[PDB]
Amino acid sequence: SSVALIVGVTGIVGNSLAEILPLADTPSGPWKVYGVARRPRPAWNEDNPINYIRCDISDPKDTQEKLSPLTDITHVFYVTWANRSTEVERCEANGKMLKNVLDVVIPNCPDLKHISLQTGRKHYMGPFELIGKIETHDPPFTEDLPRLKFDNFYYTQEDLLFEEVEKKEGLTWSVHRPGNIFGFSPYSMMNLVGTLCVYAAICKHEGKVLRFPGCKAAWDGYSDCSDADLIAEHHIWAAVDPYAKNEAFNVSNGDVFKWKHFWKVLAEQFGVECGEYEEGENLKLQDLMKGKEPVWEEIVRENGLASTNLEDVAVWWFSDAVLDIPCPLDSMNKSKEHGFLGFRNSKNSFISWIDKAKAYKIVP
Ligand SMILES: NC(=O)c1ccc[n+]([C@@H]2O[C@H](COP(=O)([O-])OP(=O)(O)OC[C@H]3O[C@@H](n4cnc5c(N)ncnc54)[C@H](OP(=O)(O)O)[C@@H]3O)[C@@H](O)[C@H]2O)c1
Ligand SMILES: CC(=O)[C@H]1CC[C@H]2[C@@H]3CCC4=CC(=O)CC[C@]4(C)[C@H]3CC[C@]12C
C-alpha cells in the first residue's frame, strides 16, 4: 500500500487531492494520506479522511518536527507557494520551503517513490511583474522549450527538485504546469472562481450589473483553464505511471472557451444582470471592490453563509491579473502521448465549482 503526503492540503488542488486520493477507484488504492498546512483545519476540509498535520514548511525546525516521524511516505504532492513583492524574493522563499520539506522526507522515507511538484504556465509566460512585457515563445506552450532568461521560482524549484531526488536511488519526480485553476478552496491565494463568485454575489445584493473587469482579449479571445480535480488526477497519474516518470507536463482541460460566454454563466448562477465588456473602461475588481467588507458581512448574515471575510474569499488582484491580459493556450500533446487522456468540459467545470462554493455556503 502507498502513502501520500499532500503539502498544502487546504489549497485549491491540495483539497482536490485530499478528496480523490482516498477514493477506492483511485489508482494505487488504498492511499494513506498526510496533509500539511498552517491554519487550523477548516470545516470544508473535514469531509475528507485526511491525517491533518499543521506545519509551517518555511521553518526548518517545524518541518523537521512535524514530518520526520512520517516514516511511511511513498509519494509527495507539493501544492503550495509563497508570494512576495519581487520574483527574486519568491525564488528564495519557495526554494527554502521546498528544500525544507525534501531534506526531511527523503532520508526518512525508505519507501519514498515519487515527488510530484506543481508549478504552472507562468513557467512559459514569466513572472507576474513581467507577464505581457517579455518576448515569450509563441503559444501553444509545449513542455520542453527553453526557459526564459528571467528569474522564475518555478525554475529555482525545478533545479532543486532535480538535485534532491538524486539522493535516493530510484527516487523519481514529475512537474505539473496548470493554467488558471477552476477549483474550490476559501484559503487559496489564487482562486479565480471563488473570487468571481463573491463579485457576482455583491453585485446581486447591490442590484448592480455584473460588469466585466478585463480586457477585450480575455472577453473575446480563446481561453482555457485547469480543473482542480483534473489537476489532482494528473498528479496521481504521473505518481503511479512509470512511463511518466521524470517529466514536466502541462495540465489543462482539453478544450477552449470565451469569457464572453462564461460571463453569462456566472451571471445566471447568481441572478444578476450580465454585463458586457465595455471599451476603454479597464475595470479592476481591486479598485471596484474597495471597502466592500460591510456589504459582504451583510450578504453573509442574510443569506446564511459561513463566517468568511472577503480578504480570504476574494483575491481581487489575482482575478485582475487573469482577466487583464490575453490567455495563451497550452498543449496537452505530451500528456496525451504519455497516456493521460483525462479531460474536463470547462463550462461544466465552471458551473460545478461555482456550485461547490454555494454548497459549502461560502457564497449565496
Ligand atoms: N491557484 C491557481 O489558480 C494556480 C494556477 C496555476 C498555477 N498555480 C501554482 O500552483 C502551485 C500551488 O499553488 P496553489 O494555487 O495550489 O496554492 P493555494 O491554493 O493557495 O494552496 C496553498 C496551500 O499551502 C498551504 N500553505 C501555505 N503556506 C504554507 C506553509 N508555509 N507551510 C505549509 N503549508 C502552507 C495553504 O494553507 P495555509 O495558508 O492555511 O497554510 C494551502 O493549503 C503554485 O506554484 C502556484 O503558483 C496556481
Ligand atoms: C484571459 C487571460 O488573459 C488569462 C487566462 C490565462 C491566464 C494566465 C495563466 C497562467 C498564469 C498563472 C498565474 O498564476 C497568474 C498569471 C497567469 C500568467 C495568467 C494571467 C492571465 C491569463 C493570460
Residue numbers in the entry: 26 to 389
Authors' account:
In order to investigate the function of this protein, which we termed PmMOR (Plantago major multisubstrate oxido-reductase), we expressed, purified and determined its activity with different substrates including 8-oxogeranial, citral and 5β-progesterone. The structural studies and enzymatic assays presented here demonstrate that PmMOR is able to accommodate diverse substrates within its active site, to catalyse the reduction of aldehydes and carbon-carbon double bonds and to perform reductive cyclisation reactions to form the iridoid backbone. Each monomer of the protein folds into two domains, a Rossmann domain that binds NADP(H) and forms much of the active site cavity and a largely α-helical capping domain. The SDR superfamily generally contains a catalytic tetrad of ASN-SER-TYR-LYS or triad consisting of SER-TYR-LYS; however, the 5ß–PORs lack this canonical tetrad or triad and are thought to use only an active site TYR and LYS residue for catalysis.
To investigate this, we co-crystallized PmMORV150M with progesterone and NADP+. The V150M point mutation yielded the best results (similar to what we observed for citral binding). Omit maps showed density in the active site, defining the location of the bound steroid. Progesterone was modeled into this density, however, despite the relatively high resolution of the data (2.56 Å). The resulting density was of poor quality, so the exact position of the ligand should be treated with caution. A second dataset of wild-type protein in complex with progesterone also yielded an extended difference map peak in the same region, into which progesterone could be modeled and refined, however the crystals diffracted to lower resolution and the map was of poorer quality. It is likely that the size of the pocket allows for significant movement of the ligand, and the observed density is an average of multiple conformations. Nevertheless, the binding region presented here of progesterone is largely consistent with the model suggested by Thorn et al.. and Hu et al., and places the C3 ketone in the same position as the aldehyde in our 8-oxogeranial and citral bound structures. By contrast, our data and model favor a conformation where the steroid is flipped 180° when compared to the previous models. This conformation fits the difference electron density much better as demonstrated by the higher correlation coefficients (CC with the difference map 1.75x higher for the flipped conformation) than the best fit from Thorn et al. and avoids a steric clash with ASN-205 which occludes part of the binding pocket in PmMOR. Single mutant V150M and double mutant V150M/I156Y resulted in increased specific activity of the PmMOR enzyme with respect to progesterone, with the mutant proteins accepting both citral and progesterone as substrate, with a clear preference for citral.
